[PDB]
Amino acid sequence: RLNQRNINELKIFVEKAKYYSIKLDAIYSEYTGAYNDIMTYIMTYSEGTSSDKSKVNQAISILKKDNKIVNKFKELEKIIEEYKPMFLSKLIDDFAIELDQAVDNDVSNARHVADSYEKLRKSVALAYIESFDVISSKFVDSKFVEASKKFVNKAKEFVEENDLIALKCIVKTIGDMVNDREINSRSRYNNFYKKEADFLGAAVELEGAYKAIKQTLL
Known about the structure:
mainly alpha; 0% strand; elongated
């Protein structure tokens, strides 16, 4: 009856986007060294600890190279094509432009490129939550829809603390629920991340609300 097609949509979204977090971690793992070389050069140059712009021109050049980072980001946008917020698309295009216009020895664009990269990485994690928000919204069940808004809001507070760590937990947690496996309410990071607990709280409320729906479709 009611809610089956809502459940199919969510199941199809979570499965399509199963690798969304690991593919974001791939961008981090590959480009973190480029980012730090920029951040470190700036702070070191900032205190008149001399100039080695080579490390920035190298950093910028490895970001630019073969459009790999832009296309890795465009892949993530397409994984959530049907639900992608406009806040993602603009930032990807703006970051492409920003990179395209980065010139050698121009250190201020560098800081800006670094800044846009960390913001874009965050937006990507926020874009998974957004998509979850759009799908969950469509459900005809007060409890699930109310559980979903708290889930979404605690997922966002978690992402503000650590985008990459939060995104990993969000994908897993919604992965587990949708695959009918018990949500684990234990902090996976032993409360090192202070927002994880509130998120898993919202998740086990969501979990009870999802289960009741599944009971209606038996």
